[PDB]
């Protein structure tokens, strides 16, 4: 009875003078026919393009959506509900000219019952001009607001618009507003307890209903069924309490769920819905590690923001499924869901894929606001816990991030922050004492929460990455339960560096440095039995408004995957440590030209979970090596080999004995011995073409025509004519202003079956041109 409203919407950037402007009669070419609206499909985000456009501040302000709804309720005397998965940031909802609901909060789910407004509209003289449909107009507003969380100091876009699914939901008279499955598993894992509680939605005040509660195991076999006859379907009710002996356990390697099926019956309705849950025991050891179902489990974590190339926050379910599968295939078993509550599609995927969850409210930097600010934080914390309570994946409710970060107010009061942090902590425990509270980086609050994360960015923002174990050990001693969220480093995808390698005769923001940093962290974690776990920050490159000068402007490039899902070299480092499915990856798939002296022995890294690997350079074996994680780097699978000036073929063959499987990888790399002077010119060429799209390549060269392989110079693309740049993707090959990667830059052009001229600019160099014909 749930209908995703995706088609037949129009969008207007900016505010209207009042709801009448959205629904008034408008003749073509009249004053009412401007401003001009844009047809869109939902989900939609205001900032799909301007978040990463290098020349503008992303839009923070009001915008409007409008559609015409075809209403046909299948239930007698039923309800019509608009169910928002999420919308940013302040939203107001109108049926014709009537305000029917509002919400402040960009990340929690909420809904509006429009039954009465629809009836009144359809019964009015105004309904005729809409020809049987009902006009729905929605205002979303992501204006900057110091008294609203999150803070504009945060390292992510505070996006605007209907960027998660909006559903039309038909209901009978009596339905469920919330279903809470309170499940607990004893330490000995042999007794599970389930309490089935619900909150009824009952606007007609039906006095009695028959409610059936049925519970099915992972194989869909019934383990409990009971009908409560003549229950009062009003407010909160405990429906069932049961003990399940030897329940099937939820685990990160074998995620298995139970299903609770609830039916509400009256003479006028039979309504069934279901909710999943899982049995699992979790324990944080005092000054010790983390245990799932009585066994120590090292949390192998990442993070994600709701952000994607081309769409900003408006990701589809299919995009979310692909991303979460990519994480699972990398070996992830833990995720902190960025700085806010995320789509329930994500939480369902964590339940189904076996990924434990830390989910937090966006009280993220700035200090502490007034009464409205505090009320929003309380409301979003309660909403998050109430809404996501049943997911077995969730082990931590987070209360905030970097709350020691000041300057959203002219005062900063540590004591007021502590007092409010303890209030939130106490509230979380009243709502759900089966999970741990946590925060990240607020040392003066580290005594308040159950689980604490400091800031540890060894080898990126401070120190060297060989400091990682020492800092983690020191920090774990300061708190009862330590869990390290956020670490890593930026890499401009397709930029590599010889300086990062141990070459035989350190590249920050290259992929070459970050693979070594990740490699080191993961091998250290094999020697830290006291460690709960960590979460790398983030899985995927994402846009941020506070980094206009990054190699990709306005993108945090610490991901191991590009903003369009393209894996970086660092993805395979994690995969080689964290998975058993045999794989093998020679570093440098996107590294076309290496460099150095003629007789240099160049370091070659292979990231593989195979037991032994043989490397071949230009067909000549360089010997077999056995994998050994502690033999850093590359877990012993490294070689130092001479490259030929010119083209080289590097091949690796690995075997994994347990799987009895052999796998191979091959790359081609040029080797350049010529040294280069400063950049002198841009050489522009058509690299390839596929259908209507052309791939254009830029190479920076010096006054003698030598490739400037260490150049990071910014390159600007422009086009005039029939085609268009495929730009503003937030990727190193989808950016019209981008730093070179080893003196190179690529961009794709949509030719539109016509002719164009591309111009390539770089400061102080002559502008270059490339003709593109169809």
CB-side neighbour CA atoms (13 Å) of 640: 10
Q: How far apart are CA 274 and CA 283, in angstroms?
A: 28
Q: Does residue number 60 form part of the binding site for a copy of itself (CB under 8 A)?
A: yes
Site for a copy of itself in 62-81 (CB under 8 A): 62
- Closer to a copy of itself by CB, 153 or 695: give it: 153
State in angstroms the smallest separation of the CB of 31 from a copy of itself.
4
User: Which residue bears the tokens 């979303």?
Assistant: 140
Site for Na ion in 117-146 (CB under 5 A): 145
- Closer to a copy of itself by CB, 188 or 410: give it: 410
Q: What is the DSSP string of 512-549?
A: HHHHHHHHHHHHHHTT-TT--EEE-S-SB-EE-TT-TT
List 548, 597, 623, 705, residue binding a copy of itself (CB under 8 A) = 548
Decide which of a copy of itself, Na ion, none touches 147; Cβ closer than 5 to 8 Å per partner kind: a copy of itself
Residue pair 142/87 in contact by the 8 Å Cβ criterion: no
Q: Does residue number 755 form part of the binding site for a copy of itself (CB under 8 A)?
A: yes
List 246, 407, 434, 664, residue binding a copy of itself (CB under 8 A) = 407
State in angstroms the smallest separation of the CB of 508 from a copy of itself.
16
- Closer to Na ion by CB, 413 or 426: give it: 413
Decide which of a copy of itself, Na ion, none touches 419; Cβ closer than 5 to 8 Å per partner kind: none
- Closer to a copy of itself by CB, 206 or 758: give it: 758
Q: Does residue number 769 form part of the binding site for a copy of itself (CB under 8 A)?
A: yes
Q: Does residue number 767 form part of the binding site for a copy of itself (CB under 8 A)?
A: yes
* DSSP code at position 287: T
Q: Does residue number 223 form part of the binding site for a copy of itself (CB under 8 A)?
A: no
Size of the site for a copy of itself (CB under 8 A): 61
- Closer to a copy of itself by CB, 33 or 464: give it: 33
Tokens for 342, please give them: 């995320």
- Closer to Na ion by CB, 258 or 554: give it: 554
Per-residue x/- track, 710-729, a copy of itself (CB under 8 A): --------xxxxx-------
* DSSP code at position 33: G
State in angstroms the smallest separation of the CB of 415 from Na ion.
22
Site for Na ion in 550-569 (CB under 5 A): 554
Q: How far apart are CA 173 and CA 404, in angstroms?
A: 48
Q: What are the angstrom distances between the C-alpha of 183 and each of 92, 155, 186, 257, 450? A: 37, 36, 10, 12, 20
Interface region with a copy of itself, contact rule CB under 8 A, candidates 15-23, 414-422, 425-433, 463-471: 15-23
Residue 309 neighbours by CB distance under 10 Å: 23
Q: Does residue number 59 form part of the binding site for a copy of itself (CB under 8 A)?
A: yes
State in angstroms the smallest separation of the CB of 17 from Na ion.
6
Q: Does residue number 727 form part of the binding site for Na ion (CB under 5 A)?
A: no
CB-side neighbour CA atoms (13 Å) of 662: 3
Q: Does residue number 761 form part of the binding site for a copy of itself (CB under 8 A)?
A: yes
- Closer to a copy of itself by CB, 159 or 574: give it: 159
Burial tier of 129 (Cβ tally within 10 Å: 0-12, 13-18, 19+)? exposed
Cis peptide before 150 (omega within 30 of 0): yes
Size of the site for Na ion (CB under 5 A): 6
User: Which residue bears the tokens 């599970």?
Assistant: 192
Q: How far apart are CA 637 and CA 613, in angstroms?
A: 7
Burial tier of 7 (Cβ tally within 10 Å: 0-12, 13-18, 19+)? exposed
Helix axes 317-329, 344-353, angle to 10 degrees: 30
Interface region with a copy of itself, contact rule CB under 8 A, candidates 137-145, 181-189, 348-356, 427-435: 137-145
Q: Is the dihedral of CA 538, 540, 545, 551 positive or negative?
A: positive
State in angstroms the smallest separation of the CB of 568 from a copy of itself.
25
Residue pair 146/366 in contact by the 8 Å Cβ criterion: yes
Site for Na ion in 21-60 (CB under 5 A): 53, 58
Spot the catalytic one: 60, 275, 402, 614: 402
List 3, 33, 372, 504, residue binding a copy of itself (CB under 8 A) = 33
Breaks in the chain after residues, C-to-N cutoff 2.5 Å: 505
Q: Is 718 a catalytic residue?
A: no
Q: Does residue number 148 form part of the binding site for Na ion (CB under 5 A)?
A: yes
Q: How far apart are CA 169 and CA 268, in angstroms?
A: 18
CB-side neighbour CA atoms (13 Å) of 615: 24
Q: What are the angstrom distances between the C-alpha of 621 and each of 470, 564, 616, 650? A: 39, 37, 4, 10
Per-residue x/- track, 147-166, a copy of itself (CB under 8 A): xx---xxxx-----------
Q: Does residue number 28 form part of the binding site for a copy of itself (CB under 8 A)?
A: yes
Q: What are the angstrom distances between the C-alpha of 349 and each of 44, 304, 555? A: 22, 13, 26
Q: Is the dihedral of CA 382, 385, 388, 389 positive or negative?
A: negative
List 10, 15, 508, 631, residue binding a copy of itself (CB under 8 A) = 15
Q: Does residue number 146 form part of the binding site for a copy of itself (CB under 8 A)?
A: yes
User: Which residue bears the tokens 């014909």?
Assistant: 773
Q: Does residue number 756 form part of the binding site for a copy of itself (CB under 8 A)?
A: yes
Q: Rounded to an integer, what is the distance from CA 404 to the centroid of its chain?
A: 24
List 2, 3, 7, 24, residue binding a copy of itself (CB under 8 A) = 24
Active site residues: 402
Q: Which residues contribute to the site for Na ion (CB under 5 A)? A: 53, 58, 145, 148, 151, 554
Q: Which residues contribute to the site for a copy of itself (CB under 8 A)? A: 12-18, 20-21, 24-25, 27-36, 57, 59-62, 97, 143-148, 152-155, 365, 407-410, 545-546, 548-549, 718-722, 754-759, 761, 766-767, 769
């Amino acid at each position: 009875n749930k209908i995703r409203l995706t088609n037949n919407w129009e969008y207007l950037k900016g505010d209207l003078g009042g709801i009448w402007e959205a629904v008034r009669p408008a003749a073509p070419g009249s004053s009412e026919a401007v401003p001009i609206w844009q047809p869109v499909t939902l989900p939609h985000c205001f900032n799909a393009e301007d978040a990463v456009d290098p020349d503008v501040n992303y839009y923070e302000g009001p915008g409007w959506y409008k559609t015409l709804l075809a209403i046909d309720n299948p239930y007698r005397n039923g309800r019509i509900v608009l169910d928002f998965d999420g919308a940013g940031q302040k939203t107001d909802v109108y049926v014709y000219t009537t305000h029917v609901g509002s919400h402040v909060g960009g990340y929690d789910s909420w809904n509006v019952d429009i039954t009465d407004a629809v009836k009144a509209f359809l019964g009015s003289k105004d309904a005729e001009r809409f020809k049987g449909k009902v006009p729905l107009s929605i205002r979303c507003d992501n204006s900057r607001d110091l008294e609203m969380i999150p803070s504009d100091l945060a390292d992510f876009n505070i996006y605007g618009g209907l960027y998660r699914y909006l559903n039309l939901v038909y209901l009978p008279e009596v339905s469920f507003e919330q279903i809470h499955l309170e499940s607990s598993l004893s330490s000995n894992l042999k007794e599970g307890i389930l309490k089935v509680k619900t909150s009824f939605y009952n606007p007609e005040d039906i006095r009695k209903a028959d409610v059936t509660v049925s519970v099915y195991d992972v194989d869909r076999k019934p383990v409990f069924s009971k009908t409560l006859e003549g229950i009062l379907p009003l407010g909160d009710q405990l429906l069932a309490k049961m003990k399940i002996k030897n329940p099937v356990l939820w685990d990160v390697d074998v995620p298995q769920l139970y299903t609770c099926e609830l039916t509400v019956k009256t003479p006028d309705q039979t309504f069934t819905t279901e909710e999943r849950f899982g049995f699992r025991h979790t324990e944080f050891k005092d000054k010790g590690p983390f245990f799932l179902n009585g066994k120590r489990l090292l949390l192998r974590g990442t993070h994600r923001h709701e952000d994607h190339a081309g769409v900003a926050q408006a990701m589809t379910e299919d995009m979310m499924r692909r991303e979460m599968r990519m994480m699972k295939d990398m070996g992830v078993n833990f995720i902190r869901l960025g700085h806010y509550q995320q789509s329930e599609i994500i939480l369902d995927l964590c339940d189904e894929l076996g990924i434990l969850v830390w989910e937090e409210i966006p009280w993220c930097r700035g200090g502490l606001g007034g009464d409205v600010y505090k009320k929003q934080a309380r409301r979003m914390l309660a909403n998050m816990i109430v809404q996501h309570h049943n997911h077995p994946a969730v082990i931590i409710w987070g209360l905030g991030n970097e709350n020691d970060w000041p300057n959203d107010f002219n005062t900063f009061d540590k004591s007021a922050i502590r007092a409010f942090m303890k209030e939130l902590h106490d509230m979380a425990h009243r709502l759900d004492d089966t999970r741990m509270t946590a925060i990240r980086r607020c040392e003066f609050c580290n005594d308040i929460v159950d689980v604490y994360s400091p800031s540890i960015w060894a080898g990126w923002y401070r120190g060297v990455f060989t400091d990682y174990k020492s800092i983690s050990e020191q920090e774990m001693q300061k708190v009862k339960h330590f869990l390290h969220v956020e670490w890593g480093g930026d890499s401009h995808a397709r930029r590599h560096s010889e300086d990062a390698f141990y070459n035989l005769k350190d590249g920050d923001w290259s992929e070459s440095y970050v693979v070594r940093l990740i490699d080191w962290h993961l091998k250290e974690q094999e020697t830290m039995p006291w460690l709960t776990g960590t979460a790398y920050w983030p899985f995927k490159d994402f846009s941020t408004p506070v980094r206009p000068d990054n190699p990709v402007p306005y993108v945090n490039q610490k991901g191991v995957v590009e903003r369009d899902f393209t894996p970086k070299e660092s993805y395979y480092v994690f995969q080689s440590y964290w998975t058993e499915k045999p794989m093998i990856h020679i570093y440098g798939h996107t590294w076309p030209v290496r460099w150095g002296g003629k007789d240099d022995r160049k370091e070659i890294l292979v990231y593989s979970n195979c037991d032994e690997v043989e490397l071949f350079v230009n067909g000549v074996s360089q010997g077999v090596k056995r994998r050994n994680s502690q033999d850093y780097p590359a877990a012993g699978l490294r070689w130092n080999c001479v490259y030929q000036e010119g083209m080289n073929e590097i091949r690796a063959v690995g075997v994994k004995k347990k799987e009895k499987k052999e796998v191979s990888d091959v790359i081609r790399q040029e080797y350049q011995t010529a040294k280069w002077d400063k950049e002198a010119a841009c050489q522009v060429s058509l690299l390839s073409e596929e259908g209507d799209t052309a791939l254009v390549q830029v190479q920076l060269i010096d006054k003698n025509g030598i490739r400037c392989l260490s150049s990071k110079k910014q390159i600007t693309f422009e086009i005039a004519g029939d085609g268009s740049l495929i730009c503003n993707l937030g990727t190193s090959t989808g950016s019209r202003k981008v730093q070179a990667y080893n003196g190179r830059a690529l961009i794709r052009i949509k030719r539109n079956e016509g002719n164009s001229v591309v111009a390539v600019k770089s400061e102080g160099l002559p502008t270059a041109f490339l003709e593109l014909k169809s």
